[PDB]
Amino acid sequence: PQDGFQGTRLIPTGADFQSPPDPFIDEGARDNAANYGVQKSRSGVDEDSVEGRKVRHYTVNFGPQHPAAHGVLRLILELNGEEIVRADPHVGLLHRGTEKLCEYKTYMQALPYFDRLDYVSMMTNEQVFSLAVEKLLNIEIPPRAKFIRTMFGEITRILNHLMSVLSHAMDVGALTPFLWGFEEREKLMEFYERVSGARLHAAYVRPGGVHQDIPVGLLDDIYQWATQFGDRIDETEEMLTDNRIWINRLKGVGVVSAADALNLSFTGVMLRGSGVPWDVRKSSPYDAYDQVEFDVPVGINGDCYDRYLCRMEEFRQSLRIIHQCLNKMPAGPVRYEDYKITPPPRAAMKENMEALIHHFLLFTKGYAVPPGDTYTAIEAPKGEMGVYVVSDGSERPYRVHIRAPGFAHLSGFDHITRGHLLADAVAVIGTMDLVFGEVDR
Amino acid sequence: ISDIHITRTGKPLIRIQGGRSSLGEHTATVFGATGQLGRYIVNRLARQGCTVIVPYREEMAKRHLKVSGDLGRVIFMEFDLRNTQSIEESVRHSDVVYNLIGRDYPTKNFSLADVHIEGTERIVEAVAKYDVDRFIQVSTYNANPDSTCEFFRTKGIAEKVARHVFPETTIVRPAPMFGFEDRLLLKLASVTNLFTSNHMREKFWPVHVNEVGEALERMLYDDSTAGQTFELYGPRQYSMAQIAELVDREIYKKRRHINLPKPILQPLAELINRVLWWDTGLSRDQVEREFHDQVIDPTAKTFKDLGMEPTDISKWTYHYLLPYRPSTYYDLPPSTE
Amino acid sequence: AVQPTKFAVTVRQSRNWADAKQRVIAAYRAWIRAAPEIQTMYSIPFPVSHIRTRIRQEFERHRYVNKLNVVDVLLQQSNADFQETMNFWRQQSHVMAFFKELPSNFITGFLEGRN
Amino acid sequence: PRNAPDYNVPIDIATSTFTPVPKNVQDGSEENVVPAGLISGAPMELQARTVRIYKPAKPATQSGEKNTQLWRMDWDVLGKGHRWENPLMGWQSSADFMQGTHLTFKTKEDAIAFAEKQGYEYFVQEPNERHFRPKAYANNFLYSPGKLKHIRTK
Amino acid sequence: ATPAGPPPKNFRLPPPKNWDEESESTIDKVGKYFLMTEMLRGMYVLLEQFFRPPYTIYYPFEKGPISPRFRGEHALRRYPSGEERCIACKLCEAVCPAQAITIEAEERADGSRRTTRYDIDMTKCIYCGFCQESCPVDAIVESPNAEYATETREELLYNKEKLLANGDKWEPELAAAIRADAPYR
Amino acid sequence: SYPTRTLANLRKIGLKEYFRQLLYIGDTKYGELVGVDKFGNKFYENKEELPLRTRWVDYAKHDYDAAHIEPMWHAWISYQVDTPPTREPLTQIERPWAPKEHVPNRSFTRGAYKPYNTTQPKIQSWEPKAAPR
Amino acid sequence: GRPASAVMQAPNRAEVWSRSQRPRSEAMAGPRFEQTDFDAQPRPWAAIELIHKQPVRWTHDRIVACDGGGGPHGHPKIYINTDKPEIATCNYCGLPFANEHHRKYLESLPQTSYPLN
Amino acid sequence: YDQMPDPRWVISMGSCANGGGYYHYSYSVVRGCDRIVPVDVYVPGCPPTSEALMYGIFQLQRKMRNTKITRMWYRK
Amino acid sequence: VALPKDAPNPRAIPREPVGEIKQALVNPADKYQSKADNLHKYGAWLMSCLPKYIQQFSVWKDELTIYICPTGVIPVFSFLKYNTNAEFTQVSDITAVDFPTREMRFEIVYNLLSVRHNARIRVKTYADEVTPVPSITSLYMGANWYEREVYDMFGVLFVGHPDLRRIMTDYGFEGHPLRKDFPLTGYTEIRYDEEKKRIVVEPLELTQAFRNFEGGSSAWDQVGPGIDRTPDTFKLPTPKPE
Ligand SMILES: NC(=O)C1=CN([C@@H]2O[C@H](COP(=O)(O)OP(=O)(O)OC[C@H]3O[C@@H](n4cnc5c(N)ncnc54)[C@H](OP(=O)(O)O)[C@@H]3O)[C@@H](O)[C@H]2O)C=CC1
Ligand SMILES: *P(=O)(O)OCC(C)(C)[C@H](O)C(=O)NCCC(=O)NCCSC(=O)CCCCCCCCCCCCC
Ligand code: SF4
Ligand code: SF4
Ligand SMILES: [Zn+2]
Asked: Distance (Å) from the C-alpha of residue A346 to the closest C-alpha of chain G?
């Protein structure tokens, strides 16, 4: 700090520790086809550093007011004719300071914020925050809550994929599958609005279990929906998987290698599309996942087509998990049985003194979370969704940082898109499955 | 200017100054605020946290005004000039009443005499009836009860009616106004204004509308401006030909006009105004004003009496005429010739 | 990796005060060279002399800094503000928010309320 | 000149009608102090405003002492703009953007170091310490050879 | 990439198949290419959708389904005697995640702990239900009503006069929702 | 609608009603009456209908608005209860303070709700009393 | 402030019932109330008048329990001592209780707070 | 919004566009879209249900149906 | 309604009653002791291979944190990317935490994943408003945007970073809003102005000021000190008696 005032030793930098490749075995000047003459500086005469700063490529603001932008993205594209030479995504247009607002909330008061990050995957966002606080609380949520959270975790996964896959098909030009799949999601938001009181922002999954217990007719209606959802997957499978216009719009598009996908912080289908077997629910089992059987779809070419085939398989695997949860649903409480953490039943709060004191303190002060920090990650429908929560030992978090899968994915946009045409950029926005509530936070 | 304003009726106003969330303590009513001038006075009053009543006629044309102020600040009242109750309902909570109601051309239900004399009569009689502190009525330049142009005569008689009923009237006489959406610079850059009776050689001292809204704001705070008469004109005199020269230099278009002899054009202009429903710019009296010339009547306060120094129209041609430059010359810098 | 944008400059530390001295002149030169180009990009109705006056004053507020590590944060901010302006990422309202077009005495401040 | 209000201090986008006149602002020439407030992006109002550095005293209403553990840094209420009543609902408006903020420090020195580096004016008050005295239950029942000065009631 | 330990059995893909190793007949491959076969199947699947019942309901004559737990606009409720249930504890003001509730209380003329102010900024609210969750006496509730769109934002600043009027009008559902949903709370 | 249904419903209700329904619902619906609002609104049910279409309302006013449905019936039309307000006991608790009349959404009218401060000001200034010199 | 629906604090009570309650006549005034239907405004009944039309629940026990009568729907269960010759009120709902030992004294008072019968 | 031709209308859907909503006390959020554009109807909820938005569109069409266009000119 | 022939009403099926429910009590921390020894050895091993830079390590439940000095960012992350026992080839995340009580305010916290070993690790370094940190964009393409977020939100330079500019805040924005001294609602706000026909910036006024209920925090400490769970293999020996 003080030494920085005058000149001192320069802080070492990645350029310093660069090493020269060995000339005996080095083959080729480019082992990657991403940099194989499909970027800037592949035309013209002089570079854009000197004497080239006076000219521009054809630059177009793709969004925010754009359908393929799916919302609030300002993707500044530099076009060589109809070809992309450089893509600069500009985000922060839905940045609302969620991570600073969480610091002036109790832990309960911050949970509805997580509903609004990936706002097609509300109950999954709730879960990653509920699992981080529960870890810092050092409590073990009951078995019925763990099975409700895994079942609504996969109902949420299907809801996200319906919005994600069919929005992506809509961008490429296929309109009808979007309409069919939005009746199914309209069906599934009844299950949300029946356990919570909201179609979208449930505020259901909370540190300690879930807010209320499921109503007595819900499991039968979920099973009734489950007996017909296979046919829904097959008829959307029937318009796209073999369609030759679908295959030639996605096969060979947005290709990322396995070793680059890890280096780009890719997770989920963006990673599994490249051939890596990786699922956070397989590698760090959370809730009731280690109690169910499901398969993990993995692609081999790392393109938009394999990512589409992996997501259409996860429809079938989510419906497979849901059936096992319906079958294995145990009895018991849905809230950890400690009123110092979770609110007591209204009956008990109106009947007994220690229940009233605990209800009063949990809704004014909040509960105190033992001091420490943690990184907690779950397999969100869009990838590894994580949270870094720092705890004071008080009732308000000192720091809440959300690790959003789509933030890590939109950053690798120029890496995989430079060299493709303008329609291929639309194809890559939808395969990469962005919601800018999580990107900007 | 201070944190305490004391009004003519003697009520004090303890103010908190800045922003749209603060307390300007003034309840104004601005008649004729959906026109061109009316927004600048309303924005000035509203964004400093004053309650502004906006009497309106057509609902969809008032909507840009609500953005000026916070919640509950800008109150819309639906009124008619010949609806005295709606006039009285609109000025009776107020400590200042702005009368900006005017029309250049006659209409099938309002003559220039009916909108100027009678409209002012009702507005001023309500100002007298409920004992409103301040009344800033906006007349025109060259207003004269002895005039022969209907515009300059009728706005000159309403001046005397207002004083006869409410002597503390601040009478404001602006020159022809320029600004955004002005009927001065935007008509000279337009293509409909091709007909003309003189050779665009009439002179006037054009004034920025932005500096006139500021002037009306300062008259509310300078209580000593009550009972006075203000001519608000610009720094230079120009003809319509000199102004049109600036416009051509800015838009890079070289507009042209068809001149007509007044005994010929004036009858036609009275037909177009009587047979078309929109403001055509053409009417018998607007041709008569076209042949008249502006005179700054002395013994009348000026911008200097508000401590304001108006800017020249030339400095504003680039800002307001740039939408009308052709694509080839659009990227060019301001003319500043 | 992804391409750095048109005016993207790698973040590097000033070697010595001579380095910082030459960079600050390079940054001031590059700003005042671009003032004619800022005016037509953002349709500034003021003349370029005013724009360059404001560039000078921004540099003058950091005139009396004798710390290399404070200058390099400052050379960072100007590089990003220059890159942001020249690529037209910001808009006219942002550029006009930069041009402003307190009481001068105790007694003036007292009489109006604090300021 | 001996802590004077400088009336030539430049204003920025954040100066309002409630911004105080500053005695001085950082410029980066000062010795041994990082001029964070010069490069932080905060307005100049943060260098015209004094903060209070203190350990909060125990509330009279409780015996718990956890809010007395640390050092707190607040921003002093200014004469105008801290609160005024909204004409519409009676809600309490404000123009002081520091009214809901406070910082917490482990030692008094840390609070001074942060305020010096940020360019705040700052006043410290020291905590009033409890005067210790032995308390004995048996004092309740001490023998009195003479007049009972009061009749204890337990 | 793959898990550490023995590599997954048969994780290495089989060697690529050549053009003359693909075991599809030329008549089938060429037929599928020229006859646009897979896309005729997709055309047909749309045809049988064309002869299926639509999903559409005729709003507002028909309404979609909402549950007892549904969270709509706020209402203040009364006991069977017409006494306000609200006692000014301020718990809902504290727990609000959006600070949309402003409460001022006093002792009433008869010495009762009652609110003098009760405002909900309906443009600050997030409709989470946390305020009705925390009520000790079931005063603040969210109605099943969602159709209350207004011309201005001043119409969305509810005072105690507007919220009691809401409870006075909606009490039969508010009671039927609490009845149906109470055991789960 | 489909030909078997539309002719079957048209036969039941009559041509005059068929054209009235083509004017408001735009559909051709037949069912049995379940009750009437305090506002005149008419409610029908037919379980032999497509899901979420088994209950519907015939709006009393021509300028029909969704906020013209009485509170208890608002739950029945929403499938939030199955017992209609005719047979529902909570519609019998006598509340003399309850609105006797129909209180709909009053926006876009002069009956639109106007908010206000329900509390007195917080600081009271001195009323000056200049004592005689 | 022309109609009674813009002056009376409540339909059942004309005057205010709190120290800080702004009178209706002082809050229905102003420009925001110049083209307004007063009877269309929310004008709820005063609970202070309603609760006091309840008759006293007479009891012989020293201590009464009130939970609001709703079971879980009511309020937290509390206990009211009835020993003072005065009508004892529940702090949550205002329901009046008296002890029969004061029946003769209360039926002698010139006025009371709740109907004794 | 400026680039949208007359006649034009604005529906504000949601607490965030109404008054900033859950992010009202943020450093980066406009406290209601009507600081930026004029607003014709406000829909409550976060989120308003699909039917609540339909109800606000039915308010706006009811406002169109009572909008006096040609009879307005006839009064002036 | 044309019901299917083999789909009975599922609600019409009787559920067998469930009465007394037994539930064992579990400390969720007990499952993490079977790898406590292993997480301490790995953290110790790194401490020995790279003693020039690694200051300390901590082990909480299943999370191992490595504390390093900022001048060692490149070599330490080079070691964690390329070593055979340290194939940490993703950066899950890069964030900062502000501790104004510390001279070095900012704690730079990186999170790494090793899909080869199914392992996670945390590395923490420190900086202040003038000390920069070596960028890791040369080893991790995915770290480009994370470091931009730290620079935007906290104001930490990353020397060597290509294209280090704002990523979250508005374009002309001044200030670092995740700093503790930055006020929650900021300093400015915007509106469209009728007189100027544009968006303008103004000093921040609020119709209702933010109500900080933090003073309602408990006067009593509610968590206590916790427990020590260090394994015996990483505690010093005790001198046995006599
Ligand atoms: N602008 C100029 O060059 C000059 C202007 N003036 C005077 O300045 C004032 C403001 O000027 P400016 O804003 O440009 O004028 P506009 O013509 O644009 O605005 C006039 C206003 O008067 C209202 N109005 C006109 N006739 C009637 C009527 N019969 N009943 C009710 N309201 C009516 C209009 O309402 P609505 O839109 O609903 O019709 C409008 O708001 C006017 O009085 C004008 O004569 C004088 C000298 C020069
Ligand atoms: P001579 O020996 O006098 O040298 C003069 C200088 C200035 C070099 C000094 O002697 C000196 O070394 N002083 C310390 C360095 C210094 O002055 N400042 C550090 C440079 S960074 C800086 O000042 C950034 C200023 C703000 C950003 C650039 C200005 C433009 C802003 C935007 C313009 C308009 C956009 C719309
Ligand atoms: S929590 Fe309920 S009872 Fe308590 S003050 Fe709020 S509304 Fe009234
Ligand atoms: S439901 Fe609305 S009023 Fe209740 S706590 Fe949530 S945001 Fe606040
Ligand atoms: Zn009771």
From this structure: 7
Distance spanning both ends of chain I, measured CA to CA = 91
**Concatenated DSSP letters for I78-137?**
HHHHHSTT----EEEEEEEEE-TTSSS-EEEEEEEEETTTTEEEEEEEEE-SS--EE--T
Residue E120's nearest CA partner among E162, E80, E78 is E162
Expressed as residue numbers, the domain containing C33 is 1-115
How many whole angstroms separate alpha carbon G52 and alpha carbon G45? 13
E108-122 CB burial, b ≥16 within 10 A, e <16: beeebebbbbbbbbb
Position A62: which residue type?
F
**Is residue G19 less than 8 Å (CB to CB) from chain E?**
yes
Instruction: With beta carbons less than 8 A apart as the criterion, state whether D31 and C112 touch.
Output: no
Helix (H) or strand (E) holding A372: strand A372-380
Ion ligand 5 residue ranges (Cβ < 5 Å): G 66, 68, 90, 92-93
Kindly report the CATH class assigned to B4-324: alpha beta
Say how far apart CA A58 and CA A51 lie, in whole Å.
18
For ligand 4, pick from E69, E96, E120, E157 the residue to mutate: most ligand atoms within 8 Å of CB.
Answer: E96
**Extents of the domains making up chain B:** 4-324
Eight-state DSSP code of residue F91: G
Residue A224: φ, ψ to 5°: -65, -45
Residues touching ligand 4 (Cβ under 6 Å) are: E 96-98, 100-101, 120, 125-131
Q: Which two tokens stand for residue G51?
A: 């609760």
User: What's the Cα-to-Cα distance from B44 to each of A190, B217, D138, I122, rounded to whole Å?
Assistant: 50, 7, 77, 56
Pocket test for ligand 3, best of E76, E78, E85, E89 (most atoms within 8 A of CB): E89
Quick check: CB of B48 below 6 Å from ligand 1? Answer: no
Handedness of CA B284, B288, B290, B294 (dihedral sign): negative
* Resolution of the solved structure (Å): 2.8
Name which of C85, A2, E154 is nearest D113 in CA terms. A2
d(CA A160, CA A171): 16
Of B77, B78, B93, the CB nearest to G30: B93
As a whole number of angstroms, the distance between CA H72 and CA A16 comes to 76
Q: Which two tokens stand for residue A66?
A: 């754009």
> Two tokens at B179?
């600004």
How far apart are alpha carbons G42 and F103 in whole angstroms?
Answer: 10
Contact A246, A172 (CB under 8 A): yes
Alpha carbon of A376 to ligand 4 centroid (Å): 28
Dist CA I27 CA F9 (whole Å): 66
Q: Which ligand is nearest to the CA of B279?
A: 1
Residues of G in contact with A346 (CB under 8 A): 72
Q: How far apart are the first and last CA of chain B?
A: 38
Answer whether E91 contacts ligand 3 (Cβ < 6 A).
Answer: yes
Q: Assess whether chains E and A touch, using the rule of 3 or more C-beta pairs within 8 angstroms.
A: yes
Which ligand 3 atom is at minimum distance from the Cα of E118? Answer: 7
Which of E2, E99, E121 lies nearest to residue I210, judging by beta carbons? E99
Amino acid at A74: R
Residue B141 DSSP label: T
- Compute CA distances I111 → E83, I54, I62, I81, whole Å: 57, 16, 14, 12
The structural domain count of chain C equals: 1
Q: Is D90 left (phi over 0), alpha (psi -120 to 50) or beta?
A: left
Give the single-character DSSP code of E14. P
Q: Which listed ligand is nearest to C20 at the C-alpha? A: 2
- From which experimental method does this structure derive? cryo-EM
